[PDB]
Amino acid sequence: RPEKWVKGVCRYCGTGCGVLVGVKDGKAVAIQGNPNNHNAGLLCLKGSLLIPVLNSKERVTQPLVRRHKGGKLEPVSWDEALDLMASRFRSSIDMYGPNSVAWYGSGQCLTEESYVANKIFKGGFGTNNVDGNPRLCMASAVGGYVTSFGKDEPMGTYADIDQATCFFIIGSNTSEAHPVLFRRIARRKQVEPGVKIIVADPRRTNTSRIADMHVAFRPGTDLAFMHSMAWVIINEELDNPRFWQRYVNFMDAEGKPSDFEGYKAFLENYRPEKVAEICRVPVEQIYGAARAFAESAATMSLWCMGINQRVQGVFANNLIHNLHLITGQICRPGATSFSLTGQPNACGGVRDGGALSHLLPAGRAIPNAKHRAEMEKLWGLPEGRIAPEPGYHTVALFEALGRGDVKCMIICETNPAHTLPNLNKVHKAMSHPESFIVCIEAFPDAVTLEYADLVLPPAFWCERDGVYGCGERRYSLTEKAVDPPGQCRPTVNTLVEFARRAGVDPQLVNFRNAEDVWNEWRMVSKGTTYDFWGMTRERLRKESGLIWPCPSEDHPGTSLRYVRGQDPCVPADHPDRFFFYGKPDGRAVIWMRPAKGAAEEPDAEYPLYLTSMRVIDHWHTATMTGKVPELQKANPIAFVEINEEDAARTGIKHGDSVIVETRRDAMELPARVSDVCRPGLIAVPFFDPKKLVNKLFLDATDPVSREPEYKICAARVRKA
Numbered sequence: 266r267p268e269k270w271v272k273g274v275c276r277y278c279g280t281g282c283g284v285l286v287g288v289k290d291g292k293a294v295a296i297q298g299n300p301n302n303h304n305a306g307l308l309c310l311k312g313s314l315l316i317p318v319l320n321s322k323e324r325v326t327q328p329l330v331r332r333h334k335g336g337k338l339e340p341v342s343w344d345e346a347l348d349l350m351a352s353r354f355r356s357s358i359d360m361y362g363p364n365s366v367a368w369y370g371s372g373q374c375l376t377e378e379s380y381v382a383n384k385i386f387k388g389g390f391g392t393n394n395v396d397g398n399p400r401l402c403m404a405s406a407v408g409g410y411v412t413s414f415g416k417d418e419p420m421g422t423y424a425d426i427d428q429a430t431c432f433f434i435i436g437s438n439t440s441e442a443h444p445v446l447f448r449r450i451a452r453r454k455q456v457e458p459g460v461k462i463i464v465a466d467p468r469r470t471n472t473s474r475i476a477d478m479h480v481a482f483r484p485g486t487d488l489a490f491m492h493s494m495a496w497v498i499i500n501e502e503l504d505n506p507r508f509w510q511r512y513v514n515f516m517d518a519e520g521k522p523s524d525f526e527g528y529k530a531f532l533e534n535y536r537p538e539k540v541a542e543i544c545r546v547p548v549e550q551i552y553g554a555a556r557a558f559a560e561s562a563a564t565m566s567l568w569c570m571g572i573n574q575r576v577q578g579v580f581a582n583n584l585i586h587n588l589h590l591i592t593g594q595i596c597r598p599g600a601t602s603f604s605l606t607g608q609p610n611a612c613g614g615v616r617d618g619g620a621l622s623h624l625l626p627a628g629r630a631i632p633n634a635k636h637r638a639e640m641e642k643l644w645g646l647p648e649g650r651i652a653p654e655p656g657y658h659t660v661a662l663f664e665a666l667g668r669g670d671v672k673c674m675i676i677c678e679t680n681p682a683h684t685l686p687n688l689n690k691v692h693k694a695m696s697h698p699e700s701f702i703v704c705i706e707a708f709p710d711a712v713t714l715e716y717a718d719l720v721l722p723p724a725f726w727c728e729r730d731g732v733y734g735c736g737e738r739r740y741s742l743t744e745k746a747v748d749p750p751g752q753c754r755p756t757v758n759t760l761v762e763f764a765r766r767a768g769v770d771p772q773l774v775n776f777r778n779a780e781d782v783w784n785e786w787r788m789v790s791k792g793t794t795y796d797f798w799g800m801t802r803e804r805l806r807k808e809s810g811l812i813w814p815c816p817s818e819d820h821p822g823t824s825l826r827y828v829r830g831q832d833p834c835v836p837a838d839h840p841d842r843f844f845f846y847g848k849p850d851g852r853a854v855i856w857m858r859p860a861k862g863a864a865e866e867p868d869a870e871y872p873l874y875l876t877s878m879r880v881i882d883h884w885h886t887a888t889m890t891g892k893v894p895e896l897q898k899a900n901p902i903a904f905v906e907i908n909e910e911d912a913a914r915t916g917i918k919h920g921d922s923v924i925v926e927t928r929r930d931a932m933e934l935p936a937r938v939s940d941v942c943r944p945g946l947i948a949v950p951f952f953d954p955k956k957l958v959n960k961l962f963l964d965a966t967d968p969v970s971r972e973p974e975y976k977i978c979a980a981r982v983r984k985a
């Protein structure tokens with residue numbers, strides 16, 4: 266049994282379960298749920314089996330160098346490693362200017378690592394080449410929220426699940442991707458059997474088995490589906506005029522102001538009978554979906570990659586918001602429009618802290634001259650040091666690296682050789698013989714390390730302290746539970762030593778530890794609509810998370826954003842009960858987004874939709890969950906899901922080896938034949954480093970958020 270229990274957060278999903286880590290003689294021996302965090306002491310199996318990961322010996326414990334392109338990683342000292350790193354970076358800026366260097370990070374870094382990296386790069390080096398994996402994930406949700414509400418992140422919280430009466434769950438396999446969360450939704454329907462659940466997803470997954478209605482639409486036709494719901498809502502007088510006349514503005518197909526009648530006329534392009542043919546669904550599912558959504562006392566939408574990993578991701582996020590805006594199912598307990606975040610710290614670390622190429626900390630933006638002044642002042646910089654132009658977004662970043670525009674790059678806590686789309690093209694880029702790539706990486710089996718020129722050994726997870734901000738705006742702290750192995754070091758300290766050594770002004774990285782950097786970041790937030798000044802380390806050790814806005818030490822935090830008398834940002838004497846203060850007139854915005862499709866659509870030559878998905882037993886590239894023997898008893902290897910009736914008609918039997926082929930590559934997989942995939946669709950997981958499916962996917966990006974469309978491309982299938 267454990268001697269003591271150290272409070273933290275699950276290293277996995279954006280559910281952000283609180284965790285308590287039992288240790289004895291400086292060794293983690295047991296894990297349980299934080300009874301006081303939102304998850305109430307529960308953890309899925311992945312969480313429950315984190316100790317063998319934490320305890321694994323197959324770990325990167327010394328710095329390593331690759332002397333030459335295509336050589337072996339050999340041991341180097343931290344001292345030699347650091348000097349190398351700083352000299353290359355500095356020399357590169359010296360020769361070619363700061364846009365020759367870049368940071369590529371992740372919503373798995375602690376908020377403090379991403380904050381310090383973001384600062385070193387944007388303020389130290391003078392480049393906005395800071396990006397990271399949430400570009401590939403949540404950037405559509407950010408676009409959707411900013412264009413609809415004028416501020417990022419949901420206005421609701423997980424606690425809204427306990428109070429919803431209808432759940433519209435689209436582009437989300439909640440059961441496999443947010444298991445504790447899916448249980449809270451399951452529990453809700455079980456408490457109140459009257460609750461309706463609508464699961465919209467081209468696949469039929471476990472998630473749908475608690476659903477009253479499963480809408481298995483044709484990939485890429487969900488926009489049309491959601492306009493059509495709106496048509497049914499307005500047509501049957503189920504909308505909420507008192508809400509929308511006061512709190513909403515309308516924008517037409519061209520983004521010019523419009524009105525309710527324009528909305529009405531625009532929708533006439535999206536009648537149920539027409540849209541049912543397009544979506545390939547019975548028409549009664551549209552009426553069904555729209556009525557459930559609108560007649561329910563409280564409606565909550567939840568969505569994830571099926572909506573965001575899409576050239577039309579921003580628009581699809583807008584369409585989900587339109588449903589809530591036209592009904593006023595929002596700013597109310599149980600009624601809210603709630604984007605699910607995948608990673609544990611995409612929200613806290615990358616979106617809120619602004620660690621993307623076009624962003625600045627705490628809701629500020631690169632193009633915005635006043636915002637840069639705000640930051641030069643806060644970071645004590647000279648005037649005009651923050652570059653006025655966005656850096657490379659992710660796909661354009663690795664394209665930059667391929668042309669040699671970006672010469673030096675740090676990849677931190679991500680596996681881009683495994684997880685970027687269009688891998689053959691990326692791999693060529695990562696092989697630029699004149700590039701210098703530094704991987705900060707814990708597990709030696711990450712495929713990306715095959716490209717590293719230098720590899721640094723980080724402290725993993727609760728081998729050091731730091732903050733995670735999950736999908737519901739909870740900031741939760743993880744304390745230090747064990748010493749890291751070998752020569753592993755907290756990345757926070759690594760970054761500082763890196764910046765001092767590369768000539769960055771040391772006023773800029775004046776941090777001994779994560780506590781220091783958290784205190785400055787509290788300051789940078791103060792008086793913005795993200796203010797978490799009230800979240801001192803003292804409170805975060807005592808509490809199992811606080812939810813922002815949280816502007817002072819006696820503030821409990823905020824459940825409902827935009828609501829008078831619940832969100833400190835809304836003036837007590839604001840004339841009305843709601844205030845979408847992210848728009849200049851306090852009104853949220855319904856957008857008339859034309860419904861299109863995928864960037865690569867099926868045709869005679871490639872007749873099938875290919876999609877890619879999450880599996881419950883493996884987390885992403887499986888460098889962690891793959892260390893846990895019991896997590897292989899279901900899914901050891903990649904497979905392709907094929908539809909029963911597509912299989913019948915083309916002679917494919919279950920278990921059979923087939924080639925899946927797209928324009929970009931071809932690859933053999935055992936076929937798992939069923940009704941999971943609707944007809945015309947095939948699906949693949951991406952956990953297998955021996956089957957790198959991103960070789961198959963195209964690269965095409967939403968033009969506004971620059972998210973890739975991993976969810977749809979055109980494939981064909983053939984018996985091997």
Ligand SMILES: Nc1nc2c(c(=O)[nH]1)N[C@H]1C(S)=C(S)[C@@H](COP(=O)(O)OP(=O)(O)OC[C@H]3O[C@@H](n4cnc5c(=O)[nH]c(N)nc54)[C@H](O)[C@@H]3O)O[C@H]1N2
Binds near residue numbers: 279468878883
């Ligand atoms: N076990 C496990 N859990 C995880 C993760 C993990 O790796 N493993 N990773 C975390 C992260 S970072 C993320 S981003 C989340 C992802 O969580 P999810 O987005 O919930 O999981 P996905 O399987 O990527 O996609 C969800 C569904 O979107 C569907 N979809 C495909 N095409 C379309 C379409 O045209 N429209 C719509 N509406 N839907 C479509 C797919 O069929 C898929 O079933 O999971 C998080 N949690």
Ligand SMILES: Nc1nc2c(c(=O)[nH]1)N[C@H]1C(S)=C(S)[C@@H](COP(=O)(O)OP(=O)(O)OC[C@H]3O[C@@H](n4cnc5c(=O)[nH]c(N)nc54)[C@H](O)[C@@H]3O)O[C@H]1N2
Binds near residue numbers: 401685725886887
């Ligand atoms: N085809 C397809 N591809 C996708 C998606 C999809 O739906 N389809 N989903 C996308 C989405 S939403 C996401 S979030 C991305 C995720 O893609 P990635 O972030 O590339 O996947 P992970 O396996 O989480 O990589 C995390 C890495 O961090 C390393 N690591 C763990 N702990 C530490 C630490 O303390 N320090 C350091 N330095 N490293 C550490 C792990 O060993 C691992 O190599 O994948 C994207 N890729």
Ligand code: SF4
Binds near residue numbers: 282445
């Ligand atoms: S649902 Fe996510 S945060 Fe909760 S224990 Fe499971 S993997 Fe971890």
Ligand SMILES: [Mo]
Binds near residue numbers: 402
């Ligand atoms: Mo993600």
